[PDB]
Symmetry: C3
Subunit: 114 residues, 3 copies
């Protein structure tokens, strides 16, 4: 899995602990070995939400399985909570997209997964 | 909706007015309340197009509905126009992808939309 | 086509030659005119893989056709090789997603491709 998140919050506010916590959370909620988990957080971005430059963010959780029409709402609760707790972004100013990737459509160690 | 765009044009050339104009445009063309619209512009990127580092960009407009096989060409006219007008990027050196996201596959305020 | 790749490796390690080589490689492997190829490399990112901040990266190759359940494994061999050769990232610390985009869902020169 890959969790990516882009935000206009300052880099200083983005800590090693945040990425390590997200990493562990994503492994748990998707039931994936953490050796497969990538986390990518991009601060200091030029963004607006609702037409204003107040703190906001947009991100994606991509995985082969684990994401799914009936699991994603739970995933969203957990991920919005950790981001709000560390970064302070309001829930009405952030999105997370969930992408279920076919195994033939993502590669790792020089090969696709199918 | 989310409009994201990555470019090698200088940050100084990227203005608050550009993001606010895009925000209003996206709300209009997708018939979405602007309270749901996110805009994300990333300058000073390391890019090539056609094998050269002249100004270029790539972006995505993602939405639950509003994008669609018969509406996207119109969207593209409008978005290419505003980006060329502000940033000066030639149309043959930029892409915009349109992504129709299922409601179960994106979250806002701690919940998916389905 | 668009090849995008995000990494925590230093910008200095990312050279004009790397982007030009990728550009030529992507044109060859997808059988696309290089005039349509965009390359986007983003260094100095805040990332983890397997819970650690050692060098890693995540990227996407998007195209109208050329990518496909039976061609992607070959694409992955080639792209992992060039990235490892230039940037030194281990194969077990990087992903590349392949996205087959419908022609109606991407625009160039102010129009969608369908």
């Amino acid at each position: 899995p890959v969790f990516s998140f882009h935000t206009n919050v300052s880099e200083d506010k983005v800590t090693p602990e945040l990425l390590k916590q997200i990493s562990a959370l994503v492994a748990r909620i998707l039931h994936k070995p953490e050796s497969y988990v990538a986390v990518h957080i991009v601060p200091d971005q030029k963004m607006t939400f609702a037409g204003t430059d107040a703190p906001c963010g947009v991100g994606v959780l991509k995985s082969i399985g684990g994401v799914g029409e009936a699991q994603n709402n739970s995933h969203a609760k957990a991920l919005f909570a950790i981001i709000k707790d560390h970064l302070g972004i309001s829930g009405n100013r952030m999105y997370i997209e969930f992408v279920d990737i076919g195994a033939a459509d993502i590669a790792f160690n020089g090969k696709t997964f199918a």
